[PDB]
Write a protein that binds this ligand. Structure first.
Ligand SMILES: Cn1cnc(-c2nccc3c(O)nc(OCCCC(F)(F)F)nc23)c1
Ligand SMILES: [Mn+2]
Length: 308
């Protein structure tokens, strides 16, 4: 059965260290760049309100077949495996909790994170059991607003929430403009509504950017990270073991299907670290740090690429 990778670093900044995100990330860099990902727990009294327009939040999540890659005599009428469904935040959550409690035969919060992790990787490699989930992924914060309060006049901000609209840890206030000569000659956060087993495969960011992720609420998001010094090692293991039909694809396309059990990387000498990102916690990914993960249950995350 699956062997959990070692835990990535977790930082608990004091109020003083919490003042400036770029300064803090710069200070922790000597350790965190050696693990690829790290977790940051804000001070206990730092609790931004959830600011999305919830009544109008409607979306059609994408369908994910956990074993699609291992499952490569074509099946009868392939391409029509699942019906299309639109949800609200509420109806997706009801669907998500029902799925998970039915799958594990227990209340959703009683399922151990280690068990969901073990079962996720078993299902990904299983050809006898076909599990299909849904992921509200890559929803633009322009659509229904950010999960953070924003002083753009589209939604009311209470006085005690203004500090969150102005916080440097509000993902809308991260620097996103890369320096270039072209910038003189001449992005917003994305939202992720997860359910149990919904997942993202191994990838790095465009321009090898940093990224930061905040889990607004819900069950944890489980991460795996590889430090940038092992990027070529991971890419070589992928080339050796990925399906030949996809081996020659450019990286931007190959990264759509680069699912790989962390133990396979670890067996080939790739350092891998893990974490469970819980509600109210940040995950930072460092430049060219490969990362992948899956959701433990119904949750809501916001992410953006930033530059230093
Ligand atoms: C484009 N992109 C760049 N980085 C990511 C990413 N970075 C950190 C965390 C992520 C998380 O939690 N979820 C997803 O969901 C993406 C959907 C994937 C599917 F459905 F196609 F398989 N992406 C995350 C996405
Ligand atoms: Mn990413």
């Amino acid at each position: 059965e699956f062997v959990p990778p070692p835990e990535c670093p977790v930082f608990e900044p004091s109020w003083e260290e919490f003042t400036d995100p770029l300064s803090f990330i710069g200070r922790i860099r000597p350790l965190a760049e050696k693990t690829g990902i790290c977790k940051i727990r804000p001070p206990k009294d730092w609790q931004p309100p959830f600011a999305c327009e919830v009544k109008s939040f409607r979306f059609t999540p994408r369908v994910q077949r956990l074993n699609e890659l291992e499952a490569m005599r074509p099946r009868e009428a392939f391409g029509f495996e699942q019906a299309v469904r639109e949800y609200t935040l509420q109806s997706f959550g009801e669907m998500a909790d029902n799925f998970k409690s039915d799958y594990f035969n227990m209340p959703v919060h009683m399922v151990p994170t280690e068990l969901v992790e073990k079962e996720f990787w078993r299902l990904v490699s299983s050809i006898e059991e076909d599990v299909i989930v849904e992921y509200g992924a890559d929803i633009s914060s322009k659509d229904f607003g950010s999960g953070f309060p924003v002083k753009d006049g589209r939604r009311k901000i209470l006085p005690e929430e203004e500090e969150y609209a102005l916080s440097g840890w509000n993902l809308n206030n991260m620097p996103v403009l890369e320096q270039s000569v072209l910038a003189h000659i001449n992005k917003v956060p994305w939202l992720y509504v997860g359910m149990c087993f919904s997942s993202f495969c191994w990838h790095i960011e465009d321009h090898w950017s940093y990224s930061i992720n905040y889990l607004h609420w819900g069950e944890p998001k489980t991460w795996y990270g590889v430090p940038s010094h092992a990027a070529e090692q991971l890419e070589e293991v992928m080339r050796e073991l990925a399906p030949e039909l996809f081996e020659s694809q450019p990286d931007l396309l190959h990264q759509l299907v680069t699912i790989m059990n962390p133990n396979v990387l670890m067996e080939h000498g790739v350092p891998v670290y893990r974490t469970n990102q819980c509600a109210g916690e940040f995950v930072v990914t460092f430049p060219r740090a490969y990362h992948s993960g899956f959701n433990q249950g119904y949750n809501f995350a916001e992410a953006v690429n930033f530059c230093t």
